[PDB]
Structure 1
Amino acid sequence: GKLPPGPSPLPVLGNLLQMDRKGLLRSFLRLREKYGDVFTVYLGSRPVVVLCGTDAIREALVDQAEAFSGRGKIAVVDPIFQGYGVIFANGERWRALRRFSLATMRDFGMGKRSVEERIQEEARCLVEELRKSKGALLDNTLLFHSITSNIICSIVFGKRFDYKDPVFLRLLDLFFQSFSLISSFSSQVFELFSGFLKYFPGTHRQIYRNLQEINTFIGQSVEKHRATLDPSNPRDFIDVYLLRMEKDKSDPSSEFHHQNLILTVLSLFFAGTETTSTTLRYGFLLMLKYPHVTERVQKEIEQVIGSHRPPALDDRAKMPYTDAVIHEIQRLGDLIPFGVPHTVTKDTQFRGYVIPKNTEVFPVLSSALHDPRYFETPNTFNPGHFLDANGALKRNEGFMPFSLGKRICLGEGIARTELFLFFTTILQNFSIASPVPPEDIDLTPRESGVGNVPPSYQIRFLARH
């Protein structure tokens, strides 16, 4: 009849500066061990419910799907205004964002050319590019960001970029390069007081460069498309925009808004490719640790796909072992350990407790991905987790990398497709190696960030013959 049990928000002088997973995990584990699978922790004076393990998470996201279908909130984590929710002042801006997001999402699933085909084309170009390395040790970060990003570029501009095209490299840099922001508590307060909120990284110097060349490219590309536009046959998304602009008679202010909102949406699409990239990077790090598994996968590729044709999405149905391996990669990859926050849409009764309407809830996906109740070896790579006695693919309750229920990842489809095609196409044409012996491969993620990302590592792709 009350909120789940948990620690008190007090004392206030109890260091409101929690900043690190190595210590947040320690705290998380302690709380779960003491209060159970469902507890409440406070962010400032804000109650946040935490769900642990496969059972609790599915009972909420699935069994009471509607109740737990509310969107999470963006809360201040700093000691000042700690816990306060932050929102856009104009509710319409938000609704417009959701609208364009969905519309654009629908448009990308259209066209004569399928996404699978573009991913195959990209996989082909990746193979060729890797060959040029003649097996030298390299950091696959740039190329893995490149292959997922190029799919969006292909869809938008009509064709992919060459990996070394300056515009493309500046684009990858704009979205994924880390930059340093220098400021004091006082200077940040002063900015807000002056009416400015600069949240994203990049000083004039840093970003003005990339951005300037990028805009020029977009400008002229929109120009070329317009000069050769065929209303009967839209080639790509730029055409779709030009056509869906016919009779868009609106003042400069409103025109600006429509245009910039599209760019903002495309930006989110680009950022989203990072989850797939990271999963691929984690996957290959894992393959380095298990050379024999990698070989089995290559063997299955040989049996089903052969070596005279590129892998196709429908080949996955006949490749249970590789499928199982990819599942393990996502499971152990554990990209979003804490899950994405939700809110209950009404006072909700859950396992004897009452979660007030609008309360934030975190389904800790990591605690499910490593659930000893459903995975025989929760902390060890094991394809058996998804295979029956006859080696056929089988599902596992603990597997929920894309989350579950009504808010399940809208991109799970394209992500799975890219994972499969990139993973199999690469291993079909290459074997991999590292100075670091298998038994010494460390799967520990970077200490920074909210998600799990493999730290930089060296790997070599040996062309097969």
Structure 2
Amino acid sequence: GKLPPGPRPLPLLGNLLQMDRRGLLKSFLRFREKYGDVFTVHLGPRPVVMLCGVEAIREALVDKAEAFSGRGKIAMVDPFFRGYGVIFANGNRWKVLRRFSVTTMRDRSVEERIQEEAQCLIEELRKSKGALMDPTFLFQSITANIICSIVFGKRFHYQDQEFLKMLNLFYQTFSLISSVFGQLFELFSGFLKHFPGAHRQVYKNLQEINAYIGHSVEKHRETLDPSAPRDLIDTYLLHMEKEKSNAHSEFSHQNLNLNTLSLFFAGTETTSTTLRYGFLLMLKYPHVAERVYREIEQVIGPHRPPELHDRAKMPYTEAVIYEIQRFSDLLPMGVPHIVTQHTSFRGYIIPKDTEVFLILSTALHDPHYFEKPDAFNPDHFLDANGALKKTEAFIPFSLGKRICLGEGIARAELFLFFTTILQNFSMASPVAPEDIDLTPQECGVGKIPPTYQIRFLPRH
């Protein structure tokens, strides 16, 4: 008849007192035990429908694309993004900005861009003389630069303190959003928005980044050559000029700054966080890293830079990376959707504008597709022959009309960066493999590995 079943809420508090202090995901997994794969949780003042397991998620996002393709808000960042840029946009705005962003994210190839950065990385790693480091900044630098060369038309130097400062702001912002306070804000932002909190810090952090984008936009405006756009910013300026007599053009300055922030954020914090978990995992499972290195020796050798064409011949490294993405579960609850029209779903009726969380973690840890899903195991992506076994449960980019638009770039990045590093270095740290704790630092919107030190030791 009406909504999916779930725990009875209270006025004001919704289902607070039935939640798990450990976080939203935990709370929803305990609801799943009781209600199955489709259920409603009242997050403070409203109902949110949760969909779990790959069948239910694909049925929503793919078979019912017409209904499930809207974007819900993330309360920690809505006040800043306010429905601007491709991530947080709906309706015609989304259509326009998605199309724009997909097209201009192809148009020097992305591969060559990543291969070049990979060489600067190796260089930077050789200069560190196997010193200990927390590699967050470095993994952010390499991925940010890929997006920077596309968006801004250049890369930044690794020791540029201003680049650093922006990366430190993404890092902090993503943690803050994913923190327990940020998960609470999701429930009670109406009330909490009047007090001091991490929500004001996030807001401020994003504004500092946006100010640089502001500047760079103006620099681009002044030096723009309409016959020779240099990058994604130039290209958007030209759409803007072309549509200036339409006051309702989506090619506005607010979309330009926030679409640009969106890309920059997505290109700096996703892949880098996955690599950071990946290198923690190589420290804890040195046998896996050793086996990857053997396949690199055999398929690539020690000198020739890895290339995307190498992937087909390296099923073991590919499986390891799939397993790194599966285990690291970057966005356990994905990004919020909303239904754009009244829909019937498995006998339930989900009114237009109901928020829908698609619990990607549930697909990724599905014990029918992955034997032992809480363990890190590259055999999850291998057949008996040792050939790559892809699976439809593997949905860490989501599915359907909102499927991550950086999937191709992200996978290229993970492959080239992971292989080029292990080609040239092994890893060490002062924590014994058996003592390494993989428990995330935060687990909210983002799952965020703990900080750790690592050394990269040149091979000889």
Q: TM-score range by the shorter chain?
A: 0.7 to 0.9
Displacement, 1:369? 0.8
What residue is the counterpart of 1:373 in the other structure?
368
Distance in 1, matches of 2:193 and 2:351, equals 34
Task: Work out which of the residue numbers 372, 383, 391 in structure 2 matches 1:388.
Answer: 383
What residue is the counterpart of 2:2 in the other structure?
2
Q: Per the alignment, do residues 75 and 172 of structure 1 end up closer, same or farther by CA in structure 2, a change over 3 Å counting?
A: closer
What residue is the counterpart of 2:115 in the other structure?
120
Count of residues in correspondence between the two structures? 438
What residue is the counterpart of 2:70 in the other structure?
71
What residue is the counterpart of 1:194 in the other structure?
none
What residue is the counterpart of 1:327 in the other structure?
322
Displacement, 1:450? 2.5
User: Residue 202 of structure 1 aligns to which amino acid in structure 2?
Assistant: K
Query: SS at the partner of 2:448?
Result: coil
Distance in 1, matches of 2:156 and 2:138, equals 12
Paired residues of 1:279 and 1:335 also in contact (CA < 8 A):
yes
Query: SS at the partner of 2:288?
Result: helix
What residue is the counterpart of 2:264 in the other structure?
270
2:297 aligned with 1:302, yes or no? yes
What residue is the counterpart of 1:82 in the other structure?
none
Displacement, 1:361? 2.1
Distance in 2, matches of 1:217 and 1:137, equals 35
Displacement, 1:463? 1.1
Task: Work out which of the residue numbers 124, 129, 132 in structure 2 matches 1:129.
Answer: 124
1:21-60 alignment runs, 5 A limit: 22-60=22-60
Task: Work out which of the residue numbers 86, 100, 103 in structure 2 matches 1:103.
Answer: 100
Distance in 1, matches of 2:381 and 2:396, equals 14
Q: Per the alignment, do residues 100 and 199 of structure 1 end up closer, same or farther by CA in structure 2, a change over 3 Å counting?
A: farther
Paired residues of 2:137 and 2:164 also in contact (CA < 8 A):
no
Paired residues of 2:60 and 2:68 also in contact (CA < 8 A):
no
2:338 aligned with 1:343, yes or no? yes
Distance in 2, matches of 1:345 and 1:254, equals 22
Paired residues of 1:280 and 1:419 also in contact (CA < 8 A):
yes
Query: SS at the partner of 2:391?
Result: coil
Displacement, 1:462? 0.6
Unaligned runs of 5+ in 1: 78-85, 192-196
1:58-457 alignment runs, 5 A limit: 58-62=58-62, 64-74=63-73, 95-96=92-93, 99-110=96-107, 113-178=108-173, 189=194, 200-202=202-204, 223=222, 225-226=223-224, 229=225, 231=227, 233-237=228-232, 239-240=234-235, 258-273=252-267, 274-447=269-442, 449-457=444-452
Q: Per the alignment, do residues 346 and 234 of structure 1 end up closer, same or farther by CA in structure 2, a change over 3 Å counting?
A: closer
Q: Per the alignment, do residues 271 and 76 of structure 1 end up closer, same or farther by CA in structure 2, a change over 3 Å counting?
A: closer
Query: SS at the partner of 1:42?
Result: strand
Query: Structure 1-normalised TM-score?
Result: 0.81
RMSD: 3.8
Displacement, 1:240? 3.6
Paired residues of 1:22 and 1:447 also in contact (CA < 8 A):
no
Distance in 2, matches of 1:248 and 1:289, equals 54
1:189-245 C-alpha deviation (Å, 9 max, x unpaired): 499xxxxx9784338xx977x88777666655665x44xx482x5443455456557
1:360-402 C-alpha deviation (Å, 9 max, x unpaired): 2222111111111211111111121111121111122321111
Percent identity at matched positions? 62
Q: Per the alignment, do residues 37 and 456 of structure 1 end up closer, same or farther by CA in structure 2, a change over 3 Å counting?
A: same
Query: SS at the partner of 1:381?
Result: coil
Q: Per the alignment, do residues 70 and 15 of structure 1 end up closer, same or farther by CA in structure 2, a change over 3 Å counting?
A: closer
User: Residue 58 of structure 2 aligns to which amino acid in structure 1?
Assistant: R
Q: Per the alignment, do residues 158 and 104 of structure 1 end up closer, same or farther by CA in structure 2, a change over 3 Å counting?
A: same
Unaligned runs of 5+ in 2: 178-188
Paired residues of 2:25 and 2:332 also in contact (CA < 8 A):
no
Distance in 2, matches of 1:100 and 1:174, equals 25
Paired residues of 1:100 and 1:262 also in contact (CA < 8 A):
no
